[PDB]
């Protein structure tokens, strides 16, 4: 789902309910249906920004170390 990517549950759930509904029309349906999950631009952007931001936090820590070394060089 959006944020709830519990694909094990979505596959079992749609498998059961699609099977029942297929039998409603005398069809046999028992498969491993390819559940896609393409999302909106803003959802994608927020989600990617999460990881981008934490990588940037680590980068800032490295830059603080860099600054300390430069302080010692100057002194």
């Amino acid at each position: 789902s959006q944020l709830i990517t519990q694909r094990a549950q979505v596959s079992l759930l749609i498998r059961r309910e699609l099977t029942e509904r297929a039998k409603d029309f005398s069809l046999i349906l028992d498969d491993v249906a390819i559940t896609e999950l393409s999302f909106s631009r803003e959802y994608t952007a927020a989600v990617e920004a999460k990881q981008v931001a934490q990588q940037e936090a680590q980068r800032a820590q490295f830059l603080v170390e860099k600054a300390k070394q430069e302080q010692r060089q100057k002194i």
Partner: protein, 98 residues
């Protein structure tokens, strides 16, 4: 099996199958436990089970590919990848492939 055999027109030519290891690439764009857009490509050699070829040519057909495996390989990749985050897909790659 492979070789020179014979046939009876009353029973007609047997169904021939590609019974040797044949590669298939499954490129997949999917998510992760941290919802990241993972590009992952799976490569598999396929054979059909010889003893199961009669049965195959009723339910699947003479083409054991393109009808079953796309769903199997695509869905399995997404179900496995969804159990790992973006970092785990590499740092725990061993387990991922298992």
């Amino acid at each position: 099996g492979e070789g020179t055999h014979f046939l009876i027109p009353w029973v007609q030519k047997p169904i021939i199958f590609d019974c040797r290891s044949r590669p298939r690439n499954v490129p997949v764009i999917t998510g992760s436990k941290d919802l990241q857009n993972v590009n992952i490509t799976l490569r598999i050699l396929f054979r059909p089970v010889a003893s199961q070829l009669p049965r195959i040519f009723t339910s699947i057909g003479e083409d054991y590919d393109e009808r079953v495996l796309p769903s199997i390989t695509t869905e399995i990749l997404k179900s496995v990848v969804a159990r790992f985050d973006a970092g785990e897909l590499i740092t725990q790659r061993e387990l991922v492939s298992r």
